[PDB]
Amino acid sequence: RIIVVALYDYEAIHHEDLSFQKGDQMVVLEESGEWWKARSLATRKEGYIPSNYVARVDSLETEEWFFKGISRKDAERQLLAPGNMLGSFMIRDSETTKGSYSLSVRDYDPRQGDTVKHYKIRTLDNGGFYISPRSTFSTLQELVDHYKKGNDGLCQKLSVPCMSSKPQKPWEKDAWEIPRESLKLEKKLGAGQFGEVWMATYNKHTKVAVKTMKPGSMSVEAFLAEANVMKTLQHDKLVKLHAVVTKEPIYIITEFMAKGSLLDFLKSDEGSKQPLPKLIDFSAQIAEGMAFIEQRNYIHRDLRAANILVSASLVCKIADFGLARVIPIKWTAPEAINFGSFTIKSDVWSFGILLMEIVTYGRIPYPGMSNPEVIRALERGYRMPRPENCPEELYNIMMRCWKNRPEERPTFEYIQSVLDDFYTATESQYEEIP
């Protein structure tokens, strides 16, 4: 008999899903991935729940101050998000020391400003935890209680856990292919050569974006096999593919991103208020999604700010992964223009051009130059000059992306790592403490 507790409130919106409140316990009847079948102990109702809204009773996940599967760089992002404060903290899974835990605390340095600091939490036998050998605790819960009153060596005494908002509800179960009838397409957001993008609603309670495909050269079955495969390549930095309407014209359904494209966003008023570190943070999120593509041995083919989407919390996600592989020379590598050699390394070239888009708040690449003019300039070894608000070191990344030989271009794994810690010396990623 397996009992889970509700981490968040959930209101049912489908046929068989259960509503519940935070703290509700439930008996697990089935584990089916995204949705579990359960019995509420509160309502005695049987039905489906999102499994990301529950954790085993008394597991660490149930604690306000604990964040499962969260990286150094995400801890920092979350802790730097609106809603938090000096001393805001989390205990999380250690990223570099598998099986152990780390503390992340919101701090403030005069010389640099709001920062997040990291402390290794240490474990062995005894089942105990210490950050510094003298100060020892039986449970993680005792550790947090300590560094809540007074900062015994810590940069900052702990105040309140980091802020969590509720996770995205998973798409309805068994609803990869849906009837068109399930959709209300409410606002045309854009339209072009291959179809349209619309703001829609799926069965009344879910806002989605819908891409409608003009019937083209491509087959129907040939288009769905790619979507089918693309849907399995889920990542936090790729827009979520939810569903498809298989009858012509093909509708593609993704999560809705509140801020539209990175390009429009950068050019908006709020866009122009983003300081360089944030612009750098955006690049790092994009590099992360591309690291993932890279590691799975895939290729985007059409990387640029028009194909990056911004959520309302300002999370960047790569869009149109898969599409340019079924179906703009200024973002394309010379080998790809000249011979059609598209590779992860030609995506790397595109990433450098996008990095320039971000630093220039959406200015077109090679301003005042035509496509032909660009082709020849690059052949003569020209590169865009460093803009004003661009640190030399950020510009060197761009230059490395634009090496004429594709083999000499960095990997996205290395770009991400450079972008992630652009203001942090390796030695300084984790605080010391006697």
Ligand X SMILES: COc1cc(-c2nn([C@H]3CC[C@H](N4CCN(C)CC4)CC3)c3ncnc(N)c23)ccc1NC(=O)c1cc2ccccc2n1C
Q: Which partner in Ca ion, ligand X, none is near 227 (CB below 5 to 8 A by kind)?
A: ligand X
Q: Is residue 389 classed as helix, strand or coil in its secondary structure?
A: coil
Q: What are the angstrom distances between the C-alpha of 12 and each of 21, 27, 50, 152, 183? A: 11, 18, 10, 46, 19
Known binding residue 196? Answer is yes
- The whole-angstrom separation of Cα 24 and Cα 20 is 6
Q: Which partner in ligand X, Ca ion, none is near 323 (CB below 5 to 8 A by kind)?
A: ligand X
- The whole-angstrom separation of Cα 334 and Cα 338 is 6
Q: Is residue 122 classed as helix, strand or coil in its secondary structure?
A: strand
DSSP, res 167: P
The answer to whether 378 contacts ligand X (rule: CB under 6 A) is no
Q: Which is nearer to Ca ion, 72 or 77 (CB)?
A: 72
The answer to whether 153 contacts ligand X (rule: CB under 6 A) is no
Q: Which is nearer to ligand X, 40 or 261 (CB)?
A: 261
Helices (H), 104-219: 140-146
- Candidate list 26, 143, 314, 319; residue touching ligand X; CB under 6 A: 319
The answer to whether 332 contacts ligand X (rule: CB under 6 A) is no
Stretch that binds ligand X, among 56-64, 92-100, 209-217, 388-396 (CB under 6 A): 209-217
Q: Which helix (H) or strand (E) holds 28?
A: strand 25-32
Q: Which is nearer to Ca ion, 176 or 430 (CB)?
A: 430
- The whole-angstrom separation of Cα 346 and Cα 252 is 27
Q: Which of 93, 107, 281, 302 is catalytic?
A: 302
Q: Which partner in ligand X, Ca ion, none is near 358 (CB below 5 to 8 A by kind)?
A: none
In the complex, residue closest to Ca ion by CB:
430
Stretch that binds ligand X, among 85-93, 167-175, 226-234, 413-421 (CB under 6 A): 226-234
Query: Could you tell me which of 149, 116, 117 has the C-alpha nearest to residue 135?
Result: 149
Q: Which partner in Ca ion, ligand X, none is near 430 (CB below 5 to 8 A by kind)?
A: Ca ion
Angle subtended at Cα 249 by Cα 245 and Cα 252, rounded to the nearest 5 degrees: 40
Footprint of ligand X on this chain (CB under 6 A)?
Answer: 189-190, 197, 209-211, 226-227, 230, 239, 241, 252-254, 256-257, 260-261, 264, 309, 319-323, 326
Would you please indicate which residues are annotated as catalytic (active-site) residues?
A: 302
